[PDB]
Design an enzyme around this catalytic site. Structure first.
Site, PDB file in Angstrom:
ATOM      1  N   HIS A 135       0.590  -0.732  -0.107  1.00 40.33           N
ATOM      2  CA  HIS A 135      -0.041  -0.045  -0.452  1.00 40.33           C
ATOM      3  C   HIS A 135       0.828   1.025  -0.052  1.00 40.33           C
ATOM      4  O   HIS A 135       1.847   1.632   1.026  1.00 40.33           O
ATOM      5  CB  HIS A 135      -1.152   0.080   0.971  1.00 40.33           C
ATOM      6  CG  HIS A 135      -1.214  -1.221   1.422  1.00 40.33           C
ATOM      7  ND1 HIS A 135      -0.853  -1.782   2.543  1.00 40.33           N
ATOM      8  CD2 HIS A 135      -2.206  -2.131   0.886  1.00 40.33           C
ATOM      9  CE1 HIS A 135      -2.122  -3.270   2.604  1.00 40.33           C
ATOM     10  NE2 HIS A 135      -2.892  -2.818   1.340  1.00 40.33           N
TER      11      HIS A 135
ATOM     12  N   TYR B  13       0.951   2.165  14.191  1.00 46.34           N
ATOM     13  CA  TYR B  13       1.908   3.232  12.813  1.00 46.34           C
ATOM     14  C   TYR B  13       1.153   5.061  13.005  1.00 46.34           C
ATOM     15  O   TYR B  13      -0.085   5.143  13.292  1.00 46.34           O
ATOM     16  CB  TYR B  13       1.911   2.939  11.825  1.00 46.34           C
ATOM     17  CG  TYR B  13       0.369   2.716  10.868  1.00 46.34           C
ATOM     18  CD1 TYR B  13       0.515   3.527  10.266  1.00 46.34           C
ATOM     19  CD2 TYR B  13       0.171   2.049  10.676  1.00 46.34           C
ATOM     20  CE1 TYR B  13      -0.900   3.480   8.542  1.00 46.34           C
ATOM     21  CE2 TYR B  13      -1.190   1.420   9.916  1.00 46.34           C
ATOM     22  CZ  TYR B  13      -1.282   2.269   8.944  1.00 46.34           C
ATOM     23  OH  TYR B  13      -2.825   2.266   8.671  1.00 46.34           O
TER      24      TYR B  13
HETATM   25  C1  TDX Z   1      -6.385   2.673   5.772  1.00 37.58           C
HETATM   26  C2  TDX Z   1      -7.497   2.114   6.942  1.00 37.58           C
HETATM   27  C3  TDX Z   1      -8.675   1.582   7.084  1.00 37.58           C
HETATM   28  N1  TDX Z   1     -10.144   1.471   7.591  1.00 37.58           N
HETATM   29  C4  TDX Z   1     -10.808   0.699   7.419  1.00 37.58           C
HETATM   30  C5  TDX Z   1     -11.249   0.301   6.624  1.00 37.58           C
HETATM   31  C6  TDX Z   1     -11.518  -1.729   6.541  1.00 37.58           C
HETATM   32  O1  TDX Z   1     -12.466  -1.827   7.093  1.00 37.58           O
HETATM   33  C7  TDX Z   1     -10.431  -1.859   7.476  1.00 37.58           C
HETATM   34  C8  TDX Z   1      -9.187  -2.286   7.375  1.00 37.58           C
HETATM   35  O2  TDX Z   1      -9.011  -2.163   6.158  1.00 37.58           O
HETATM   36  P1  TDX Z   1      -8.055  -2.199   5.323  1.00 37.58           P
HETATM   37  O3  TDX Z   1      -7.502  -1.344   4.246  1.00 37.58           O
HETATM   38  O4  TDX Z   1      -7.859  -3.768   4.907  1.00 37.58           O
HETATM   39  O5  TDX Z   1      -6.305  -2.259   6.172  1.00 37.58           O
HETATM   40  P2  TDX Z   1      -4.889  -3.410   5.487  1.00 37.58           P
HETATM   41  O6  TDX Z   1      -4.945  -3.915   4.485  1.00 37.58           O
HETATM   42  O7  TDX Z   1      -4.454  -3.274   7.705  1.00 37.58           O
HETATM   43  O8  TDX Z   1      -3.527  -1.938   5.440  1.00 37.58           O
HETATM   44  C9  TDX Z   1      -3.733  -1.090   6.341  1.00 37.58           C
HETATM   45  O9  TDX Z   1      -2.646  -1.008   7.369  1.00 37.58           O
HETATM   46  C10 TDX Z   1      -1.289  -1.203   6.444  1.00 37.58           C
HETATM   47  C11 TDX Z   1      -0.684   0.015   5.569  1.00 37.58           C
HETATM   48  O10 TDX Z   1       0.567  -0.210   4.654  1.00 37.58           O
HETATM   49  C12 TDX Z   1      -2.173   0.716   4.826  1.00 37.58           C
HETATM   50  O11 TDX Z   1      -1.839   1.955   4.439  1.00 37.58           O
HETATM   51  C13 TDX Z   1      -3.618   0.723   5.605  1.00 37.58           C
HETATM   52  O12 TDX Z   1      -4.340   0.536   4.527  1.00 37.58           O
HETATM   53  O13 TDX Z   1     -10.221  -1.109   8.327  1.00 37.58           O
HETATM   54  C14 TDX Z   1     -10.461   2.856   8.518  1.00 37.58           C
HETATM   55  O14 TDX Z   1     -10.922   2.943   8.776  1.00 37.58           O
HETATM   56  N2  TDX Z   1      -9.049   3.806   8.394  1.00 37.58           N
HETATM   57  C15 TDX Z   1      -8.040   3.811   7.908  1.00 37.58           C
HETATM   58  O15 TDX Z   1      -7.606   4.862   7.910  1.00 37.58           O
END
Ligand code: TDX
Ligand code: TDX
Ligand code: NI
Lengths: 196, 196
Positions: A75, A139
């Site tokens: 990402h 983070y």
């Molecule tokens: C990134 C982010 C996600 N969310 C929610 C959306 C989903 O329901 C859930 C998980 O989101 P994902 O995009 O699947 O997160 P993930 O794959 O864990 O990646 C995150 O952590 C690693 C980071 O590198 C990345 O930027 C960030 O998107 O959290 C939020 O509510 N707020 C956020 O800032």
């Protein structure tokens, strides 16, 4: 240094990915557990943590909790990230530079636990795979994610075999539908200075 | 109805201790574990998170990892705190107002897991006892450790039986020597507005 407890706070650049910094974090243990200053602004600026991180006055702290073999990533959203582990776990951290230029496609990997942190500049794709039974991954970022804006963000597929990275367990990686369907590197438009 | 996943981001006062806020944090679960925005400045200022937290441009993130029955505190450190849990653990959070005025000696307790956070104003003593096998306790503060400020600390002994609090296992608490020896509430000098 390698020791978990008692390190001197220090920083080292990552040669292949400009702007990235790897930190040794002091952790102090006793019978009750341990304590760290995970981030300390006054102490980290002289070590090269960039003042531009703070320029817009934006701050968010995200935390994920994951089990062994969970893989999250590649990402490259338009914000900087300061990454660390908040519990006794460990991850294989993985980075792929997606910025337009001589470093496009460059990679780095290293094991992160509570005694190490990483500064990831905007434009460098971030990911990890969980090595411990579980991990708390905490983070800091300096701009604000919106679900609706995800099409505007940059991503690269963790499984693209042309990437010079090696995951701990690619085949049994536990992943999101999103991470399964991100584009391969050849379909990623390199991020220009004006996209960041 | 259960109260860990999918809460709406919300804040509430603690009647007994002015300036404190308790937040419900959205925790999003999936196949990998879970994810939260532990702190999000833009979303949290509208809910009453004080802008004075950011006034001096200072920032430190601490983490302590603690084992079961560990009890830390009653410490009123010379800075504000934003407290939460970063892993799957839980603590009994405990607060005693040490500010000069009509709420001196007032208390509050509540269970904190990753779906809850607490803003603790300067002058309010903070503490916790670990209820799970381990816990990652991650917090933000707005000043830096200095011996020039130690005169501005106040402490109360966790085991003063006249405090309007109850711990989970008092008898089996694992406490540091320093915490054993803090003054009883009777012998604490209330913190004045100048000390914060
Ligand atoms: C990134 C982010 C996600 N969310 C929610 C959306 C989903 O329901 C859930 C998980 O989101 P994902 O995009 O699947 O997160 P993930 O794959 O864990 O990646 C995150 O952590 C690693 C980071 O590198 C990345 O930027 C960030 O998107 O959290 C939020 O509510 N707020 C956020 O800032
Ligand atoms: C507060 C603080 C402490 N330390 C060091 C001092 C010790 O070597 C080590 C452990 O701290 P202790 O003095 O034993 O305090 P502890 O019981 O770990 O309590 C801390 O974590 C829980 C918090 O509630 C509390 O305010 C905080 O002081 O960490 C730092 O390096 N930086 C700090 O900001
Ligand atoms: Ni205003």
């Amino acid at each position: 240094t390698e020791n978990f407890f008692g390190k001197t706070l220090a920083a080292r650049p990552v040669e292949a990915i400009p702007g990235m910094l790897e930190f040794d974090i002091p952790v102090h243990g006793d019978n009750r557990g341990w304590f760290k200053e995970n981030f300390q602004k006054e102490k980290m600026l002289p070590l090269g943590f960039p003042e531009s991180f703070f320029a817009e006055g934006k701050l968010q702290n995200n935390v994920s909790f994951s089990r062994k073999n969970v893989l999250r990533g590649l990402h490259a959203e338009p914000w900087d990230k300061y990454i660390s582990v908040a519990d006794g776990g460990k991850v294989l951290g993985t980075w792929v530079d997606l910025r337009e230029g001589e470093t496009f496609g460059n990679t780095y990997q290293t094991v992160i636990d509570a005694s190490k942190s990483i500064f990831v500049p905007r434009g460098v794709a971030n990911g990890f795979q969980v090595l411990s039974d579980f991990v708390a991954y905490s983070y800091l970022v300096n701009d604000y994610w919106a679900l609706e804006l995800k099409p505007k963000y940059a991503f690269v597929n963790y499984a693209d075999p042309s990437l010079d990275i090696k995951w701990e367990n690619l085949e049994e990686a536990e992943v999101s539908e999103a991470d399964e369907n991100h584009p391969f590197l050849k379909d990623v438009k390199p991020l220009r200075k004006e996209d960041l």
